Structure 1
């Protein structure tokens, strides 16, 4: 009550903009890139989407109601109604939002960066892409800020397609 009108449509975005950080900063494997908040009556259902729900389920609740005990206690939210419904997040190169997470990690565990680079490309440009875009500009064992690069395609941006093709 005593609720400001337009602020509730902007405060939730701030709430949106910070919950995603742990799905960056805590996990690496399953691909849970895109978060999705579905608010039903009196319950906030952010859908847990994990390809391997054993970090979260485990011994019947490894991190089902373990991750919630931070975040629901972080926002002074009520317990129980912090529903985190489990699902599977989508495919690795064969999705749209995962192409962030597809290449968030796929530079090597210690060999040459070209053989890192030329691996990532041949998968999805034939199997479900004509545009993706990663970032590399770094050195090779000297005192130079050299900039070698690659990408795979021209994109689709023709106007308002900057603002539905850019995403979380």
Structure 2
């Protein structure tokens, strides 16, 4: 159980764990209203706070899904056994959570629905929830086999500076 890697390499390996997880989860919790994570190592314990809007579908009946997820991480990155501990979290104010708003629009569209009325419906929600402004783009095909672009915009926006 030693020694330990250089301080320069210490941050890179943390970043790789922070990033890989964040795309692992997005391919499973897409329908559950995923919105991110926030990792924290704590004394002799890992915390992985799995942020999603509806904790219901994440939990499952008898906590099956959360049990699957913990057993995965325990084998995959070769964690010492029983150190890993998951936690869930529900976010309040869901219209500032761009990641979830975009991935909700996805399943509305892929569910089979018109584009204009869908874009309007998501727009007023993120405006209502609080926001100076907001924007939506849909670039690709529709009504033939040449591509187009469709912008739906309301309020303020910024594009330059820090």
Shorter-chain TM band: 0.7 to 0.9
Within 5 Å, which residues of 2 pair with 1:79-158?
79-93=81-95, 96=96, 98-106=97-105, 107-108=108-109, 109-156=111-158
TM-score, normalised relative to structure 1: 0.79
In the alignment, structure 1 segments of 5+ residues that lack a partner are 161-168
Whether the aligned pair in 2 keeps the contact of 1:138 and 1:148 (CA below 8 Å) is no
Greater strand content = 2
Instruction: Indicate which of 54, 58, 61 corresponds to 1:58.
Output: 61
2:22 and 2:149 map into 1 onto residues whose CA distance is 31
* Structure 2 CA distance for partners of 1:6 and 1:16, relative to 1, 3 Å: same
Q: Residue 39 of structure 1 corresponds to which residue in structure 2?
A: 41
TM-score, normalised relative to structure 2: 0.81
Greater helix content = 2
Per-residue CA distance 1:14-62 (angstroms, 9 max, x = gap): 1111101132100134433121011112211111334333542521x31
Aligned residues: 156
Q: Residue 29 of structure 2 corresponds to which residue in structure 1?
A: 27
What is the SS of the residue equivalent to 2:143?
A: coil
2:126 and 2:104 map into 1 onto residues whose CA distance is 17
Whether the aligned pair in 2 keeps the contact of 1:23 and 1:33 (CA below 8 Å) is no
Following TM superposition, where does structure 1 have runs of at least 4 consecutive aligned residues deviating by more than 6 angstroms? none
Whether the aligned pair in 1 keeps the contact of 2:29 and 2:58 (CA below 8 Å) is no
Deviation at 1:111, TM superposition (A): 2.7
Whether the aligned pair in 2 keeps the contact of 1:31 and 1:89 (CA below 8 Å) is no
In the alignment, structure 2 segments of 5+ residues that lack a partner are none
Q: What's the RMSD between the two structures over aligned residues?
A: 2.3
1:37 and 1:15 map into 2 onto residues whose CA distance is 10
